[PDB]
Amino acid sequence: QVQLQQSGAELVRPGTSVKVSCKASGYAFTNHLIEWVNQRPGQGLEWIGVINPGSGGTKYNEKFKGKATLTADKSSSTAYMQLSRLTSDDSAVYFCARSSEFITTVAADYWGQGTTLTVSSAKTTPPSVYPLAPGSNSMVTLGCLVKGYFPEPVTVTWNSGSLSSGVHTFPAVLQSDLYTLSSSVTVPSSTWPSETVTCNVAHPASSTKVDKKIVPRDCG
Amino acid sequence: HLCGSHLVEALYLVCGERGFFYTP
Amino acid sequence: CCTSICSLYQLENYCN
Amino acid sequence: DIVMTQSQKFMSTSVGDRVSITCKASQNVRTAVAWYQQRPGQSPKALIYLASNRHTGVPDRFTGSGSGTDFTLTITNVQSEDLADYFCLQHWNYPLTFGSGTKLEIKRADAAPTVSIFPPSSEQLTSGGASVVCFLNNFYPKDINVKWKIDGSERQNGVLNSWTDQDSKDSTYSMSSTLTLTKDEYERHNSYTCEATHKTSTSPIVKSFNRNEC
């Protein structure tokens, strides 16, 4: 069946080096060219380079010459990509993909699952969780601000899962090497403050689990 | 296959109806 | 074009 | 380097209609162009090879055409599982280059944003910082302007925006806008205003609070 299984995610500091694996199965490995492609958060795709695994020949995107080094181990049927001089601009998802034999008449017909690379000098930091209350016949919006944590991800649920429906958890943004996000929730007017809304924030990397009950803040 | 069958197929794709010659 | 990576463009130099 | 231009970064459609995604090469690339599909959270998957050939297993509603510079991927009778990103690529000469992508989205009736402003919490104020948050929720189409005013002056410094993709369930968009200040700058001002301008109305939606009333 054509199948490419990539190595696990990588979270390292700038200036270091990393080596990502891509194990092929289900075809004659030696002569099919293997491409490498990256995807930065929210962006499109950029081609890095290609390797002829049997011959060992390579061709590089000029932007990646001397940053990327592509190799192949015919024994294990594994392709390798090494990235040096890592900066935070290199944080991205890296894909290997199979193309046709010897030369690319068909490009990237099977893709590996991708490898996430995160390049950061920051250290594991738990999030500060702040309530977003609006004060007090339709529908009221509450929020949970999840600020200054590293690394991704956090998960926000509302009322230990009880609320699910009117939930927006926004994408995080990187401000000064730390991540921030907010999660909105809309519950019936006769549910709040009448009853109880609590946000549950979990940040596994710091071993954190916090609940913030939303209390009114009648401004005016 | 070896190299030449794949090379000759690529030549056929690239050179369209203007043909090509090939001697190994 | 078999040990080294060629490009379909580089092959145009063999047509008619 | 060849540039592959997908002139349309977003395309709305209804299930069962016909869509045509263009891709123009910067120079002649013969028929060495490929089309890929990428669903959210997934690897790309190959669709069309050598400009017009379907890969094995890909449904027949997908059709690739073109030669020279103007290439096209036409989907007849678009289905819901077709909502995704589509990238062209050229492999005529190195480096291989991708188009910058077309996101295919479901069309729906216009919806104005529900705008909510929230003062920074006293929890955060005791840490020397003050984040003012504004939600702009459940609107359609995606385009929206957000403007903050502190004591009537347009404030652009300290504002970080965040957008969701189209909602799996009701097809709308959402947006948070967050003004992050030091406590001292925050307590230096009184009136904080979040202003949204969306096509559903000539008037901005205006939400505000006065700090001396919290």
C5 and A57 within 8 Å at the Cβ level: the answer is yes
Please check whether residue A215 touches D, CB under 8 A: no
> Which residues, listed in sequence order, are joined to residue D207 by a DSSP beta bridge?
D194
Please check whether residue D32 touches C, CB under 8 A: yes
D94 and C7 within 8 Å at the Cβ level: the answer is yes
- H-run or E-run covering D183: helix D183-186
The total of other beta-carbon atoms located within 10 Å of residue D213's CB is 11
Name which of D49, D95, D174 is nearest A62 (Cβ-Cβ).
D95
SS3 of residue D93 by DSSP: coil
Q: Can you tell me the distance from the alpha carbon of A53 to that of A29, in angstroms, rounded to the nearest whole number?
A: 7
- Provide the residue type at A6 as one letter: Q
User: Tell me, which fold does domain A3-119 have in CATH?
Assistant: Immunoglobulin-like (2.60.40)
Chain B residues touching D30 at Cβ < 8 A: 14, 16
Q: Can you tell me the distance from the alpha carbon of A115 to that of A22, in angstroms, rounded to the nearest whole number?
A: 9
Closest B-chain CA to D93? B14
Burial category of A212 from C-beta neighbours within 10 Å (exposed 0-12, middle 13-18, buried 19 and up): buried
Contact A145, A130 (CB under 8 A): yes
CATH 2.60.40.10 at D4-106, yes or no: yes
Q: Can you tell me the distance from the alpha carbon of D79 to that of D18, in angstroms, rounded to the nearest whole number?
A: 10
The total of other beta-carbon atoms located within 10 Å of residue A161's CB is 8
- H-run or E-run covering D124: helix D122-125
Q: Can you tell me the distance from the alpha carbon of A153 to that of A145, in angstroms, rounded to the nearest whole number?
A: 14
Q: Can you tell me the distance from the alpha carbon of D88 to that of D138, in angstroms, rounded to the nearest whole number?
A: 31
B14 and D30 within 8 Å at the Cβ level: the answer is yes
SS3 of chain B: the string is CCCHHHHHHHHHHHCHHHCCCCCC
D98: Cα within 13 Å, side-chain hemisphere:
22
Contact D134, D115 (CB under 8 A): yes
Chain D residues touching B13 at Cβ < 8 A: 31, 50
Approach to solving:
X-ray
How many angstroms away from the CA of A34 is the closest CA of chain C?
11
Chain D residues touching A103 at Cβ < 8 A: none
Q: How far is CA A62 from the centre of its chain?
A: 26
Contact A150, A125 (CB under 8 A): yes
D76: Cα within 13 Å, side-chain hemisphere:
5
Contact D47, D60 (CB under 8 A): no
Resolution (A): 2.4
Where in chain D are all domains bearing CATH 2.60.40.10?
Answer: 4-106, 114-210
Among residues 1-16 of chain C, which lie with CB inside 8 Å of chain B?
A: 1-2, 8-9, 11-12, 14-16
Asked if domains A3-119 and A128-213 share a fold, the reply is yes
Domain boundaries, chain A: 3-119, 128-213
User: Tell me, which fold does domain A128-213 have in CATH?
Assistant: Immunoglobulin-like (2.60.40)
Contact A134, A215 (CB under 8 A): no
Chain A interface disruption, residue of B3, B8, B13, most A CBs within 10 A? B3
Q: Can you tell me the distance from the alpha carbon of D142 to that of D128, in angstroms, rounded to the nearest whole number?
A: 35
- D114-210: CATH class: mainly beta
